[PDB]
Design an enzyme around this catalytic site. Structure first.
Site, PDB file in Angstrom:
ATOM      1  N   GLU A 145      40.798  56.674  47.420  1.00  0.00           N
ATOM      2  CA  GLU A 145      42.112  56.755  46.760  1.00  0.00           C
ATOM      3  C   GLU A 145      43.285  56.486  47.690  1.00  0.00           C
ATOM      4  O   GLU A 145      44.421  56.415  47.240  1.00  0.00           O
ATOM      5  CB  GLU A 145      42.302  58.116  46.096  1.00  0.00           C
ATOM      6  N   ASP A 159      51.950  54.401  41.571  1.00  0.00           N
ATOM      7  CA  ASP A 159      50.559  53.976  41.310  1.00  0.00           C
ATOM      8  C   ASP A 159      50.501  52.735  40.423  1.00  0.00           C
ATOM      9  O   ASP A 159      51.539  52.210  40.040  1.00  0.00           O
ATOM     10  CB  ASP A 159      49.711  55.123  40.764  1.00  0.00           C
TER      11      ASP A 159
END
Ligand code: NA
Ligand code: NA
Ligand code: NA
Ligand code: NA
Ligand code: NA
Ligand code: NA
Ligand code: NA
Ligand code: NA
Lengths: 329, 329
Positions: free
Chosen positions: A176, A185
Site C-alpha cells: 500500500e 488516493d
C-alpha cells in the site's frame, strides 16, 4: 500524642493496591508448609542474573536498592529503547511490573513474569488489574535486564501492541506504500501513511483535522515515519477488534499463526471486513490448515482477478506462513 | 503440565483474608523509605521476651516455629485458663490473633496488640474484621506469653465479655443472691442464678425450657456455678445493650468508670431500665461527677425508702467509686 495512629487497615500505601489483581507467570517457585505462603520467600529467577524475587501470597515483588543487600537487586540500567515510539522484538519474553521508586529504592509488583507480548497485552487488560496499573509506575524489565519506564499505563499498552503489530508493517508498506504527507488516493480521497484514508471530504482542512485527531497534535499535514507506524498500529488494532466481533472471521483468525494473521489483516486493509467475510470456503480451508487448497481457492476469486500481483503475494503468505513473497520488496 | 497454575490472585490462602480488616495497636514501630512498608520488617515487641513480629503493610504477623529461627518465635505454651468458662483479669492488656497452625508452624495475624479487654471487644465487632475472624483460628496471647486457643470467634468474644462483666459479679451476688437450682422469687416466679427470672408462667416445665434455652443444654433445672456466671454475663450484656439504646442512660453510662458502671447496672437489675431512666436529676449529677450531690439525691428517692440497705450499698459505690460497701459481704 493524640494524633498517633492506633488503627491500621489496607487503605493507602505505598505502592497502592500492591497485592491486588493477578500475576501471569509460567514459572512457579517450589518452596515449603502451606500455611507459610504469606511469609516472604526469596528466589533467584532461573536463568537470570540480578533477578531476585520476593514472594508473598504467591505474588512476586521485584525490589532494587542502591545499598548492597542479600535481599534486593542492584539498580538496573535503563534501556535506550524509546518508551514513545520503540518496540521489543516480538518473540522476546518480557517482565511487566508496576510500583514506585525513590531515593535509590524501587519496589515493584510483578504483573507478568517472562511472558510473551501477546500474553502481556491480554493480562494487562483484565478488569481486576485496573487499580494497580492506573495508580502506580509501570515498566518492562527486558530479557537483558535493562528497563523501559513508561509515563503511564496506556503508553505501555500501546508499546506492546506496536511490538506485535509491527510484524505486519513491511508487508502492508510493500502493498500500500508509505507516505509522510497527505496525498490523494486513486479515488481522489485524502490519504497518508500506509493507505490510511483520512476522509472522503474534498476539504483538505477536514483531512488535516482528522489527521490531527488520530496523531494527537497539530501536524499541518506532515507526519514522521514513526507516526506512520502509529496510524498503522491504530488501523491494525481496529481491524483485529472488528475481526474478533465477526462470527465469520474470529474462528479463522484465532486459528492462524502471526505471519498468516498478517495476510488476513492485509485482505481487510484492501477490501474491508465485510468483503473478507465473503470468502466462506477459502476461510474454512485456512481454519482447517489446508494451506495448498486455500491458496488454490483464493486464486479463483474476483479479488485475485482485480489485483493479481498483490493477491499472489498474500496467497503465498497464506500458503507457506513465510515472508517469501515480500523479501526485497 | 497442563494443570500448572499460571495465574495467581488473592483468592484462597493460607490463612484466609490475612491482610484484610484492621489492627488496633497503641504500639507503632518506627522503621525507615516510605515505599518499602510492604517489605517485611522484623521487630521485638518492647518489654517482652519471645515476641518477635513481622510487619507487612503496617500489619503485624506473629509466627511461631519449632525449628530454631532468627525470624520466628519459639512455640508458646498453652495457658491453663479455661476457654469455655475462664477469664483474664480485667486490667491486663491482651493480644488477640487470628490464623492457622500445623506441623509445628504457626502463622497468626495480630488483630489487637497489647490492648485492653474493652478495646478488644469493640475492635472484634467491626464489620471489616468479620471475614478474617470467621475463617481462621482465634487465640489470645496473654501478658505472660501463654496462649488461650478458642474453638470459634464467639467463644473468644464471650470470654472477653465475661472478663469485663465479672467485675460486677460479687456485687450483684451480694445484693440478689446466687442459687444453682430453680426457686421461686418473693413474687412466686421461677428464678435461678443471680436473680435471673426464667418466666412468669406457673409451669416449672416452662421455666426449665427457658433455662435450657439460655444455657444451651438439658439442665433439668440445675446449673453449675460457672453457668450462673454465664446467665449473669447474658443479663449484664442485655442491660448494657439497653442502656446504650436509651438516650436518658447512655450519656451517664459513657461517662462512668467500671466500678460506678456496676452500680448503674445494679439499679437496672433491681428495677428495670425504665425505672432507672426516671432518676433524671441524680443521673445528671453522676454524669457531671458530682458524687456527693448524686449520693445525697439518690437517698431521697422511693427506691431508697423501699430497699434502704441495698440502696445504701449502691449509693456508696456511686459516691466513692470503690467496693467499700461490699467488702466481706
Ligand atoms: Na512459556
Ligand atoms: Na503458552
Ligand atoms: Na509465558
Ligand atoms: Na471463498
Ligand atoms: Na495503652
Ligand atoms: Na487509651
Ligand atoms: Na491499648
Ligand atoms: Na433523680
Amino acid at each position: 500524642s493524640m494524633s498517633d495512629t492506633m488503627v491500621v487497615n489496607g487503605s493507602g500505601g505505598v505502592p497502592a493496591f500492591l497485592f491486588s489483581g493477578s500475576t501471569l507467570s509460567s514459572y512457579r517457585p517450589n518452596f515449603e508448609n502451606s500455611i507459610t505462603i504469606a511469609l516472604p520467600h526469596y528466589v533467584d529467577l532461573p536463568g537470570r542474573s540480578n533477578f531476585k524475587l520476593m514472594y508473598i501470597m504467591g505474588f512476586p515483588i521485584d525490589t532494587e536498592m542502591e545499598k548492597d543487600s542479600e535481599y534486593s537487586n542492584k539498580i538496573r540500567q535503563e534501556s535506550k529503547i524509546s518508551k514513545t515510539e520503540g518496540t521489543v522484538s516480538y518473540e522476546q519474553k518480557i517482565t511487566v511490573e508496576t510500583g514506585q521508586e525513590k531515593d535509590g529504592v524501587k519496589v515493584y509488583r510483578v504483573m507478568v513474569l517472562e511472558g510473551t507480548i501477546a500474553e502481556s497485552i491480554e493480562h494487562l487488560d483484565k478488569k481486576e488489574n485496573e487499580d494497580i496499573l492506573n495508580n502506580n509506575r509501570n515498566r518492562i524489565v527486558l530479557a537483558d535486564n535493562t528497563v523501559i519506564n513508561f509515563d503511564n499505563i496506556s503508553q505501555l499498552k500501546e508499546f506492546l501492541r506496536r511490538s506485535v503489530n509491527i510484524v505486519c508493517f513491511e508487508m502492508l508498506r510493500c502493498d500500500e506504500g508509505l507516505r509522510l504527507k497527505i496525498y490523494k488516493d486513486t479515488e481522489g480521497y485524502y490519504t497518508i501513511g500506509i493507505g490510511h484514508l483520512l476522509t472522503k471530504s474534498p476539504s483538505l482542512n477536514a483531512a488535516k483535522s482528522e489527521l490531527d485527531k488520530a496523531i494527537g497534535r497539530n501536524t499541518n499535514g506532515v507526519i514522521t515515519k514513526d507516526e506512520a507506524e502509529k496510524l498503522f498500529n491504530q488501523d491494525v488494532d481496529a481491524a483485529v477488534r472488528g475481526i474478533l466481533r465477526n462470527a465469520k472471521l474470529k474462528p479463522v483468525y484465532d486459528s492462524l499463526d502471526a505471519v498468516r494473521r498478517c495476510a488476513l489483516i492485509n485482505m481487510v486493509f484492501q477490501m474491508g471486513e465485510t468483503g473478507v467475510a465473503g470468502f466462506t470456503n477459502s476461510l474454512r480451508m485456512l481454519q482447517q490448515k489446508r494451506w495448498d487448497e486455500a491458496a488454490v481457492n483464493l486464486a479463483k476469486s474476483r479479488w485475485y482477478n482485480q489485483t493479481p500481483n498483490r493477491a499472489k503475494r498474500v496467497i503465498t503468505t497464506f500458503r507457506t506462513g513465510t515472508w517469501d513473497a515480500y523479501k526485497n520488496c
